[PDB]
Amino acid sequence: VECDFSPLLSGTPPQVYNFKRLVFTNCNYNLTKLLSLFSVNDFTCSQISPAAIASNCYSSLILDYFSYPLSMKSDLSVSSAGPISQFNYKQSFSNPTCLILATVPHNLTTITKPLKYSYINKCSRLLSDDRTEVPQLVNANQYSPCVSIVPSTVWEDGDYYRKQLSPLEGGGWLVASGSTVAMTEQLQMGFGITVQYGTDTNSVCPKL
Amino acid sequence: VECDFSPLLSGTPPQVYNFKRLVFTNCNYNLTKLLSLFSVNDFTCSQISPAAIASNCYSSLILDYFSYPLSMKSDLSVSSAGPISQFNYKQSFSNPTCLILATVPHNLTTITKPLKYSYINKCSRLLSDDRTEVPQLVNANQYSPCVSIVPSTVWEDGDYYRKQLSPLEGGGWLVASGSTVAMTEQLQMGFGITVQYGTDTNSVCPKL
Numbered sequence: 001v002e003c004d005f006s007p008l009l010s011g012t013p014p015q016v017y018n019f020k021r022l023v024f025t026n027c028n029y030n031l032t033k034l035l036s037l038f039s040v041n042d043f044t045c046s047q048i049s050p051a052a053i054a055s056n057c058y059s060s061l062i063l064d065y066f067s068y069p070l071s072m073k074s075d076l077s078v079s080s081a082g083p084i085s086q087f088n089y090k091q092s093f094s095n096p097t098c099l100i101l102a103t104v105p106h107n108l109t110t111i112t113k114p115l116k117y118s119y120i121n122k123c124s125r126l127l128s129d130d131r132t133e134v135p136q137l138v139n140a141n142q143y144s145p146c147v148s149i150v151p152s153t154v155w156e157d158g159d160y161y162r163k164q165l166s167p168l169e170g171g172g173w174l175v176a177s178g179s180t181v182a183m184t185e186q187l188q189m190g191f192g193i194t195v196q197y198g199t200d201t202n203s204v205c206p207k208l
Numbered sequence: 209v210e211c212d213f214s215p216l217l218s219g220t221p222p223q224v225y226n227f228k229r230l231v232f233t234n235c236n237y238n239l240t241k242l243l244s245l246f247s248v249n250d251f252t253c254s255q256i257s258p259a260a261i262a263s264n265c266y267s268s269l270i271l272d273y274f275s276y277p278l279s280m281k282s283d284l285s286v287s288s289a290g291p292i293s294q295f296n297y298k299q300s301f302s303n304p305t306c307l308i309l310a311t312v313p314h315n316l317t318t319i320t321k322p323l324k325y326s327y328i329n330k331c332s333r334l335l336s337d338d339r340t341e342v343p344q345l346v347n348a349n350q351y352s353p354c355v356s357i358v359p360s361t362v363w364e365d366g367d368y369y370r371k372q373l374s375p376l377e378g379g380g381w382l383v384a385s386g387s388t389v390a391m392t393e394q395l396q397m398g399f400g401i402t403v404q405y406g407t408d409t410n411s412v413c414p415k416l
């Protein structure tokens with residue numbers, strides 16, 4: 001009962017490529033209660049509406065959250081080759097999904113701002129001819145291949161990261177670069193919601 | 209006239225974190241001559257080519273040199289994943305740069321070898337909540353913060369270095385650790401060249 005959204009509200013939210021995932025089964029939610037704490041700037045979904053997602057019964061509810069600047073809202077779409085959607089964060093194309101951009105108010109003191117917003121601007125793989133670069137696109141529900149060599153906070157805008165791969169990995173080099181965006185007055189976050197429907201398993205139902 | 213590259217030839221070159229920086233203005237260089245003294249093993253550039261950096265006029269020419277083993281060439285190509293560009297040395301993002309990895313030949317007698325190669329493997333900041341490590345990484349065209357606690361040669365591999373920082377710089381600790389690599393028969397060095405272009409001030413020109 002009463003699925004718990006506190007860990008979203010405690011501490012510094014990770015950057016987009018290090019998004020923290022919360023999974024909910026066999027409990028009951030009030031989504032609009034959580035969103036009342038925030039200034040909601042954007043709310044868009046796919047195969048579901050904002051009204052429907054707050055009042056439907058699921059077999060599973062996944063909620064990713066991270067720090068995200070409102071400047072880069074257009075990067076959060078697969079239509080455009082934005083670095084975020086190619087290399088940092090990508091939602092399932094086969095489940096109903098929603099994406100929420102929100103501003104943490106000042107009265108909400110339990111969330112703490114990082115120094116800045118970081119993100120991966122490139123994650124590619126160098127082939128054995130040492131000439132071809134192949135992009136390494138992030139998959140749905142997975143972190144980027146390049147998170148192993150990119151720190152949780154980009155130190156300097158334009159930093160470059162590389163890792164020599166073993167024969168078991170396929171050879172070549174894994175190359176990444178990170179960029180940073182200046183912190184805003186109030187922290188701005190992203191929230192990705194995914195839901196699954198079952199047959200009898202629909203055990204995440206709204207509270208009333 | 210008379211850019212002077214000879215101090216690079218007299219004495220013992222420092223370690224990578226103590227790189228000696230020579231700044232040249234209003235003179236005439238012949239870099240090909242300098243490079244003939246050595247047995248160059250790698251010549252890599254950014255926003256400039258080796259042909260171009262030898263035959264162009266600049267408003268400033270910065271030359272850094274230090275002792276560096278060739279077996280750590282991989283520790284260079286990783287850059288912000290490895291500790292050399294985190295803690296020891298990082299060239300400009302904003303001006304064009306080249307990095308040359310060279311061997312001292314025996315004919316060169318005025319360059320004496322040091323005991324071993326030393327580099328900083330960790331330089332972080334313990335807070336006063338006595339776990340908190342916050343790394344203190346290097347910026348472009350700057351030295352590591354932890355030089356002030358690290359000797360010119362790391363005595364033994366793994367040595368730790370701590371100094372408490374005063375309340376007026378902030379309070380807590382500054383810890384660092386060092387790592388060593390056995391000296392080779394013939395000294396191996398590394399050269400970093402950075403160039404700036406001026407409006408009319410491009411006085412540093414090649415010799416004709």
Ligand SMILES: *[C@@H]1O[C@H](CO)[C@@H](O)[C@H](O)[C@H]1NC(C)=O
Nearest residue numbers: 030031032033036206207208
């Ligand atoms: C959720 O909580 C809000 C107040 O924060 C309330 O207005 C709303 O009716 C609640 N919704 C449900 C489904 O319990």
